[PDB]
Paper text:
From an in vitro translation reaction of the MifM stalling construct in [name] lysates, we purified disomes from a sucrose density gradient. A tenfold excess of [name] protein was added to the disomes and the reaction was incubated in the presence of AMP-PNP. We observe two major classes of collided disomes: one with only [name] density in the interribosomal space and another with an additional density next to the [name] (B and EV3). The latter class also contains additional density next to uS10 on both the stalled and the collided ribosomes. By local refinement of the experimental data and rigid body-fitting of a model of [name] generated in Alphafold2, we identified these extra densities as the SMR and KOW domains, respectively. Only one SMR domain is visible, next to the [name] in the inter-ribosomal space, interacting with both ribosomes. On the stalled ribosome, the SMR domain interacts with uS11 and uS7, as does SmrB; on the collided ribosome, the SMR domain is positioned next to uS3. The two KOW domains bind to ribosome protein uS10 in a manner that is highly similar to the KOW domain of NusG, an E. coli protein involved in transcription-translation coupling. The KOW domain on the collided ribosome is connected to the SMR domain by partial density, consistent with a flexible loop joining them, arguing that these domains derive from the same [name] monomer. Here, only in disomes where both ribosomes adopt a non-rotated (or classical) conformation do we find density corresponding to the SMR domain, despite the presence of collided disomes in other states in our dataset.
In [name], the related protein [name] was recently implicated in ribosome rescue. Here we show that [name] is recruited to collisions by its SMR and KOW domains, and we reveal the interaction of these domains with collided ribosomes by cryo-EM. Using a combination of in vivo and in vitro approaches, we show that [name] uses its ABC ATPase activity to split ribosomes, targeting the nascent peptide for degradation through the ribosome quality control pathway. However, unlike SmrB, which cleaves [name] in E. coli, we see no evidence that [name] mediates [name] cleavage or promotes ribosome rescue by tmRNA.
Author numbering:
A (entry chain Z): 2 to 273
B (entry chain s): 2 to 91
C (entry chain 2): 1 to 44
Amino acid sequence: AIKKYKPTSNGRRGMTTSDFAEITTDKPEKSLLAPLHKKGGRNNQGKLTVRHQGGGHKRQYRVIDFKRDKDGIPGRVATVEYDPNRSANIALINYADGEKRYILAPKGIQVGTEIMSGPEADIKVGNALPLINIPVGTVVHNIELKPGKGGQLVRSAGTSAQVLGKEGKYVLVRLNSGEVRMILSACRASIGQVGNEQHELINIGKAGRSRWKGIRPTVRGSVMNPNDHPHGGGEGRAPIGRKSPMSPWGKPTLGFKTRKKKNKSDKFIVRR
Amino acid sequence: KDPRDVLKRPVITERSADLMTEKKYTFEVDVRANKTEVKDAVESIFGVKVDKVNIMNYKGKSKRVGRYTGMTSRRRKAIVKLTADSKEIE
Amino acid sequence: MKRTFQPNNRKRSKVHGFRSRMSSKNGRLVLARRRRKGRKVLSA
RNA sequence: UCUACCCAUGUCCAGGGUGAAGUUCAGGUAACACUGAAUGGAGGCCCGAACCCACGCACGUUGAAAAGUGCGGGGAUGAGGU
RNA sequence: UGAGUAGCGAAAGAGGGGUGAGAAUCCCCUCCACCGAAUGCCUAAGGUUUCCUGAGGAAGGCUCGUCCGCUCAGGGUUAGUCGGGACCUAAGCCGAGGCCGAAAGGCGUAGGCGAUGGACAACAGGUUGAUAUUCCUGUACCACCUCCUCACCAUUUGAGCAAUGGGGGGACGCAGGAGGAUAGGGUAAGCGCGGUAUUGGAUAUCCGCGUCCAAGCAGUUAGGCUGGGAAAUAGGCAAAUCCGUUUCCCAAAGGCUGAGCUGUGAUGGCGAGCGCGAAGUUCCUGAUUCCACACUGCCAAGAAAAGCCUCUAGCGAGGUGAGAGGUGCCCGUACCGCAAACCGACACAGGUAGGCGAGGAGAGAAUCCUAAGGUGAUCGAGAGAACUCUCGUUAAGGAACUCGGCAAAAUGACCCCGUAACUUCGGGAGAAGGGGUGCUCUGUUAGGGUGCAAGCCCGAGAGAGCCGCAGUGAAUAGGCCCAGGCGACUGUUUAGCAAAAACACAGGUCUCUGCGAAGCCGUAAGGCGAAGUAUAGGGGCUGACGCCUGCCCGGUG
């Protein structure tokens, strides 16, 4: 699923890209595009709050249904499309009643297969169930915290979650990175592995490709000046003589946990 | 408003004398007056029929005398093309 | 050798025009003190 | 209104080379590789105008000019210039 | 004071006439010269009368000045179709309600503003001193209205009308390559007009000039784009004939769009040339333009909305269509705009967005000289010293000079031949480095394009000869090689002393964060992150690739 360019120029020396055999078409469907202008890392008052961002190729948003609301209608899918929003490629599925909708394409999905969405759906890849009907030990994705909100938790390419068990009002599912969490039983997740698994195997060769992607370059703090960063200054190349390394805003940035220790959510994380 | 005020004074140049031969007439009109009420004014008060009206306005020329640097009046000049076999004007 | 002043009437009246100064409170103080001073061209 | 960066929307890049990946054909093998022709046209590709930049030298230094000119230079389909 | 000194701001004029009180500087004429992908022609931003005419020369003009971008007195800009408004919306801005905040205020919904975008109907001739798709001329087109005209429908089993509601559209990137057409170009042929010269020669395959016409209307077309029909209907907040979706049947028809081209517009205009006015065709070449973002491929995956069409809800008793007659507002319109009117304090060797942008040779907008066209650029003449600067040559030696081949010199085009170590097999590599290039004839060469031909265009080569010291005879287009650091590379940076080994970079690694993520801005509402979800974000460090990355947790964190 990954092809490597033979090195003709010097930019393309280590230069692999993802071919699009999984992708079945090129034109996006008209009624579901959404306008989307890049903010360029600027706040509502215009100040820059996120570094290293802004200035990519222009993109058009595609509204995609994380909610999986419509229940019981047999949905067929005839496409697989590349979305230039998030790593995964997303698939338009068209319903029996005559309305078309967009879905994250899961692993091993193909054209023409059927999709069910109810709380009585059989568990096949791409289906949607509330967690109470999901059997234990099944790989699942697109989970949400609040019911009716729409899937939030596992959406990136090749990412997965397997249900460790139900125990009542709450269900134990193991998210990605393994830090298991204890969540409502009434939320609707989508069955399977997300269908762009090989995405880490991309090798950006050119810096211009990341510039197309929309990544501004990142400067080290050690080559800063004294005022604008705690590391900067010192002639020659100096090691960071500031005990633990700290961020541009003074917070140390090497392994101290940063979450509000008095939050509400921490009574669900602590299974681990 | 009153039609007897909408056009102020005619202007007598060599160009104007040329156009009265071929039956177009020159007038200086009010600044707020536009292409049409000058037309309705002129057939209301002249008994003439006018085919086409052209309008253009001049801004004041800068002009110097003594040590003061004043500005002359902004003007709006109107051209009225009478129809065939329409009456003439003084 | 592009010099420090390129003229643009639209940007000039947008950033220094009378409506632009009256839109703010601080601009109103600017108008008031200029008028107390007695400037002929009172706003840009 | 200079300049740095960013947002939306336009515009510009005379010309000549190189020849990728695929595709077809010929062999090749049970098949798969593979081998050769044609095709194909990719490149933060090459050479080089407009355009942009400013590497060297000379002059200029009460200058044509409060930062330039002349002779050469670099990029020149891109992280492009405007 | 310097001192009558420096300077008088890139440039080829010269001569005769004329004005004048005064003439290198003003005007007229003849030659010469300069630019000509511009120093030509339009037109932005901007300036605001600098534009034209007639007077004047105190100041401005680096001199003069009879002169003008100066002064004075007049005069000059005409639009239903061009540009912008009464059309739409992006970024952004404002913002009733509201939400926050010691006060001022900040944020923001509905909504509105906001072109650099989308849509949107006139053109080619003439005209003066100044304007011209605006004025005159002829042919048009768009929107709207009805004192009128004819044709048709139904005036509730209703003709007609259609929405601030759905649906389609508008609706889109980049690169490359055919093809089709037209600009444009050659004067090749033919045609017309004028001429045949005095310097040796030339009524002759001789010389100079010209050899065209829209928009609209009717057809046609290179083409591109499209399957069509029927039934049913968990949808598109309400409806469905519209759209969407399944099932059944036919597969090419048909439809959409379409550069251009034919007639007409044209019994008219333009047209070399002395108010009049001839010929006004064919051939070849032929795009940087159009078909057209049409196709193909590519991945970084490529605006909104209203114009426009459709559907019902709805309105509905008079309308629809064609004539005939009428209506059609505001603002801009001069002049300059690579310049002496703009920005640089100046009539400043600088900068200044877009459209067109010819010929010879040429791959070309390079290069040199010219066309159309514009200009001789505002101090001069006259000696031809030192010295400074920009250039051109130098015998012999050739890098000795010099910190350093700095500078300068040398190679340079096209076609053949040939081309190494290393290599990440792409490269290195135009490696190096050789050889040929002019003209004439064999030849309107093989051969090819174009056309039925006639003719026109392109020209691989060889073979005989002719000259020059020299044949890409000028202008302009790599010096090269061998090693070694440093940095993988293209890139970026101290405007105005430092472009580098500095920064970035792809890659790597560590670390935080389970989504009202973390982090950041703000007190806060609000945001960014992100209309994203550990294959994702944030931070630190190192810097392609290859081989590796040892020991110490006593101290600090």
